[PDB]
C-alpha cells in the first residue's frame, strides 16, 4: 500500500514485485513514564535476520485454512534485539517483517498474511482471516513483501510477561503446477523499526531462552543410559513398531526437570531394598512377597510415588508364569552391609490379580524359598531371564493412582522416535546357582547428559530444536527434532524394525522450528 | 593531577580526599580502518560496576612488594561492555577505574598503583614500581581515586587475542594501628571512557567467559561419584591429613575436559575385562596373573594410557601380602555373556617387584585357583577387603611412563580440599563363597555434573569462582573456591579429620576472585 | 546488495614502496579461479557451495602478479553470471565473514553476518563488492583473511522438467588495490594456471602392480570406496600411508623365519618381515616395509585364496634356488592377526629353516581369488599413519589405472598354479609430478580434459588434492573401460561441489 | 558496450537484443609510407556477406572448451574485398563482424567470443579465454 516496485525477470518471461504495506497504523508511545530511554546501535536497524521458526513449504497437498506460521511481535524476532533484551527491563516499538517467496511465472495460487491483536483467538479458515487487517500475494509474481508490524499495547512500555499481537500466514488459494513435485518456499526476516527503544539497564541474568544454543561435542557413547546403567550406549535406534513410550525413568523435561520416577543420577539410585513381608503365591517352586522401602515416602500416601526413586521399569509381560521373569542380586541385610549376595528371580506384584500383575507398587515377587520373615534385603535389578525378548522389556508396566506419573507419548504422524541402545550382558551358571539370564537390549528415550546443557539455555516458548548429527567428519549429516517434552524424532519413509545409526556423535544446533515443521532430510529405513 | 576535592568528615576529626588522575596520556584512535563504528547506549558510560577479582584486604601482616591486584584493560572490566562484546568483532578505547578505600584518620601507611604497558613483566617491589607512571595514596585521608586508564596499542583497533596493558596495586608503606585487628578494604569499579567504541556486529556466539555464571540448583546427592558409582553421594568432607590428591578418575578441567583416566560416564566405563595370561606368584593360596584389555589402545604404546578408560583407582597399599586386597566380581566369558559370576580378590601388578607393585599397567592379580589359560574374564571392582581402611583407599597407585597422566595437586597454604563421600556397602558371606569385604568410604575430588554447567560458561582467564553453599533455607551459608583445575577448597582454622557437611545443596555463584583471594567466611574444624 | 559491508580505503602510508598496477587490469573482468559451481534440485539447503578468501587470488592477473610481491591492500568487485531458465525458481545467500570468525553451520546463522539474498530469476549480472577487513595498514602474506561464503537458501525447484543451473563469477581489482615490496617471483602462491606435460597413462607406472604396463583406465559400479595403502599420493604431503615414489625399487622385500606353524592340509610355516626403517618396531611407525604388497585375499578364507611369491634362501651375496610358494598375511582365525597389514605372515614351505633370511616377491594371487577380492586391502590398526578410506561424492565414480597380471603354471609340483587377475590403482606418481610445482588453490579441485581420438572425443574428470580422480556418470556399471591413448589437459579450477556437464553412460 | 538495442518478440513472450561492442580499441594507421592510397567503392562498406567457414551448430552434446570457430582478420573475410585484393599489393584496416544467433526464450546457455593478437596460441578452455578482450 505504501509503495510498490516491479522488475522484469531475466529473459523477460515474467515479473517480480516488491511491496511495502502497513495494514494497521502504528501508534508511537511518548515514553513519558520511562525513567530512562536507552537507544540502540544504529546498525541494528539495518540488519534483517532470519526469524526463529520462520520457514515452511507449500505443496499441492497443503490446503487453505491450515495455519502455516504464527509468531508474536516481540524482541525475540531479531537475533540482536533478543541478545540485547537480557540487559534491560522493558521495551517498546514495532518491527518490519519481510516475507521472501520463491515463486515462478508458470504456477498458480495465492497467500494471505494478517495481524491478530492481543487476546484474540486465531481462526482456522482463510475466509475469517480476511476480517483482520491483511495482505494477499500471488505466487506468479511475488518476490518480497515487507509488513510494518505495529506494537499493539495499552501501556506506556512493556515488562516481561504481557500478551502480544501475532502475525499469521495461510494459504488463500491452493498451489497448482504442471510438475507434480513443485513447491513454494517461504522465509521471514525481521529488524526493529526506527522507533524501537529499551529502558532500565539491569544485570544480564534473565530466564529468557538464548537465541543460540551451544551444545558440547560429547558423543552419545560418553553418555549414561537411564534405564540400564553400567552398560555404555552403543548406537542410536529407530523402530517402526514402537509407536509410543510409557517409560518412567528416562523422562526429562525442559521446564520441570525430571518427570515421573526419573533421576539425574541413575547409577546412584539403581539400588533399592525390600522388607520380605509374609505371604506367598503358588508355583512349581515357592515364590514370596516383599514390600519395597520408600525412604522418600515414609507414609504410603497416594500423592507421592509408590516406588523408590529411579528404581526400575523393565516390564516383564502381561502374563508370564513360568516363561519370563526379572533377575536381580539379593542378599540379607546384616551389620555393616549384606551377606550371601547372589542372583534371584523376581517380578512386580502378584500374578493372577489385575491391577497388581504389572504395575508400580511396593509388592514384588522373590524367588527365595528361604526368605526370612520381616528382614531387609538388597535388590540390584541386573537383567531378565526366561522367554523375555526386546519387545517385552520395551513395554513398561502401567501406573495408577494420583502420583503425577509420566504420561505416555507418541510421535507426530510421519515421524519416529530415536532411542539409545545398550547391550545387556547375559549371565550364565553351570552349578546350582539358580538362574540363567539371556542377552537383551534396552532403549531409553533420552539421557540426562544431553538435556543438562539445554537447562542452562532454555527453549524459546512454543518452539522445538532442529539438530544436526555429524558422523563421518561432516560428509554424512542427519537431522533430528528435539522436543521440550524430552524425546527426539526423525523423518522416515521406509519400514524397518532394525535401523542402526553409529554413535560417533558431535551433536550440532541448526535452528528453532515449529512443532509441525517437516524435516528436509529423510531417513530411508528400507536400506 | 587533573583535579582534587577535599571534604570534612562528620565531627571534624579528619578529612577525605577524592582525586582524578591521568598518569599516562591517552592517544585517541581515528578508527579510519574500521568498516563500521558502532556506538554504545549512552547510559553505559555513567554506570560504575564492580570489577571481577577486584577486591583485597590489607592487614598489618601484608608486606610491600607483594602484588595485591593485577588486571588487564579490556571490555571484561565492566559488566555491560563484557556482555555487549559478544555481538562484535573488535573494540577500541580506554576505561576509568575507581579505587575505593575504607581508610581512617588514626592509621598509617601508603598505597601505590601503576600502569604496565603490554609485553612488560610485572616487578615484585614497590621500589621498581615507581619507574612506571603511578600514583600514591595515604590511608589516613584516602577515600576514592579515579584513574583514567588508557588503551595502549599500536593498531587501529583490537581483535580478540592481543596483548594488553595492566593495572597493578601494591603496598607502598606497611599498615600500622593501635588495634591489632584493623585492616583496610580495597575495591575497584570501572566504566568505559566516552571514546570507547565497538565495530562489526556478528552473531553472538563466542568463546569468551560469561560475566555471570548460572548454576543449576541440583543438590550434591543428585550427583554421581566418579570413584564409586552405584553409591549416592551422602555428604561433603574436609580432612586435614589429606594435603594432596593423586587420583585419576575424578579429574576434570575447564579447558581440556577430562584429565588422566577420567570419563563423563563413570557408571558406563566401570567395567573391564582381562585375558588371564600364564604365570603365577607365591602365596598361601594360589594367585594368578592377567593382562587387562585395552580396546582404545590396541597396540600397547607408551603414548596412550595403559589401562582401560575410567577403570579403577582404589589403591590397596605400598605392601600388603595377606592384609589388604581388592575384591571384584569375576566370570569366564562365554557366548552371549559370562557364567559363574562371583566375588574374588585381586590387586594391581605383582607384589615383591617395584614399579609393578602399585602402578597402572595391564598386569593384575586374580584370586582364582582354577583360572583357565588365555580366556577372557569380567571384572567389576566392587570394593575392598582385609585390613584396608579409608586412608589406604584415599592414596591411589603411582603412574609412570609418558601417557600424560593427571598431575598431583595440593591446596594453597591455609586451605583444605572439599570431597564427596559415599558409603560403600560391605559384602559378607557365610558359606564357602571365598571373600568378605569390609565397610569403607570413598572420596572424589569433583563430580562431572557440577563441571558440566561450567563448560557452557567458561571461566574468565586467570580467575577462580567463589561459590555460596546454602543449606538451611539461607540461614547457614558456606563459601568455597572452585579452581579451573577442578577442585574445591575452603578456609579453615582448626584441626580435625572428620568434619561433615550436609548435602542439602543449592550451589550459588557469588563472584570471580583471584587465586590468592582469602575467603571471608571461616570454617572452624574444632567444632 | 551491491555492498553488504562498506570498504575502507587505506592510505598505505607505512609501506616502504607503493607499487601500482597496469591501468588496464582494473578495466576488464576475468573469471575467478575456482569461482564456478552448480545448483541442482538434489542440493540440500544450508550446504556451502563456494568459499573464497578475499585475496589477490580472486583474479588471475593479480594472482599471477602476486608471486612477485610481499604485501597487498584493497578489495575486489565481483559480478555474477547465471545460466538460468524460465521454469525454475530458487534463492541463494552470499555473506562476508570477518577474519578470525568461524564460518556458520546453517543458513539461519549466516544471516547474522552482512549478506544479501539472490533470486535465480533476477540474479544474472548482479554485482557484489568484496571488501578486505584489515588489521595493519597492509597485509603480509600468511595473515588471516575474511572470506565470502555462498549457500543455498531456498532449494531449486522447477515447474517443468528440472534443469541444473551453472554459476560463474568474474572479478577485477577495486581502484584502491595496490602491491608492495617487489620480491623474487618464486613465492608460495598457487599459480592460476596449471601446465601438464603430455604423458599417456600407459607411459605411467602402476604403483600397485609394477612390471605390468597400465593397459587402460577403468570405471566400476561396485567399487564404492578405496582403502589401499600403495597408490596414495597427496599434493600437500606427497606419499601417503605406505606409498613410495619408486614402486618397482621397493617391490622386493625379505623376511626371517619364525618358530611355530599352524594347521593346514600341507604345512603352513611362519615368517616375519624385516623393517629396515623401523629397527625397534615401535608402534608409531609402519608395521611393514615401505612399498610392500597390499592385496587382499578373502576376509578369513586362508585356504581358499592364497597370495603367491618367489622365495629363496639367503646366501652370501645373493639368494639360492628361488621358486614359487604360497603365502598370506597373519596367522588366520584372528581379528588383528588375520587379513591385517602387519609384519606377521606365513609361507607354504614344507621345510623352512629357522632364523634364515628369505626373499618375498608378491608376484600374483592364486586359488579361488578374483579381482574383486584383490582390490579389498587388508585392514590397518595401530597408531602409525595409514591412508584414510575415501569415497567419491554422491553421483560420481572413481577412475582407476588398470593393469593385467599374467598367470603362472607348472607341470612339476613347484608349489602353485597362479590365476590371471586384473589390478587397479587409484593414482600414479607420474601424474602428480607436475602438480608439486604449481600448488592447488585452497580447497579447490582441478577439472581435467582427457582427449583421445585427436580431438574427436573428450572426457572430463575431477582430480582431487587428496589424490583420486572421479567422473560423473548417468549409468553405473562394472565393465566400462576408457582407452589409454592419453593426453591429459587442464581445463580450470572448480568448487568440490561442481557437477561435470559431460556425462559418461555406463549401463550402455 | 558502444550501444545496445532491445526489441519485443511477436506475442510478447521474450525479447531480442542487438549490441555493438569494441572490446579492443582500433589504432588507425596514417599510411604515411604508402606510395598511393586506393579507395574502395563506397557500396562495399554497406554489404554484409557470409564469411567462408563461418557456420556451426551447438547441441546439448557440445562441451565448453572446444573451439567452434577460428578466423583471421584479413581481406578474405568479405566476398568483395577478397576479389579486389587480387589487383593490389597491400592493405590496411579492420572489419566489422556480425554474429547471428537463432535463440529462443525457453532455452539456457551462454556463448563467448574473443580476439587473439598475432603470434599467440589459442587456449582450449573458456576459463582462459576470459583473459583476452571478449
Residue numbers in the entry:
A (entry chain C), B (entry chain C): 1 to 527
C (entry chain B): 20 to 527
D (entry chain C): 1 to 134
Please quote the authors directly:
To reduce this disulfide bond, we treated one sample with DTT and the other one without DTT to serve as the control sample. These two datasets used the same batch of viruses and were collected in the same session. The OptiPrep was largely dialyzed away for this sample. The identity of this extra density is unknown. Notably, four of these mutations are situated on the top surface of the P2 domain, which serves as the interaction surface with host cell receptors. An elongated extra density was found at the interface of the two subunits in both the A/B dimers and the C/C dimers near residues P425, V341 and M352. The pocket around it is mostly composed of hydrophobic residues (F329, V341, I380, M382, P425) with only one charged residue, D342, and one polar residue, T432.
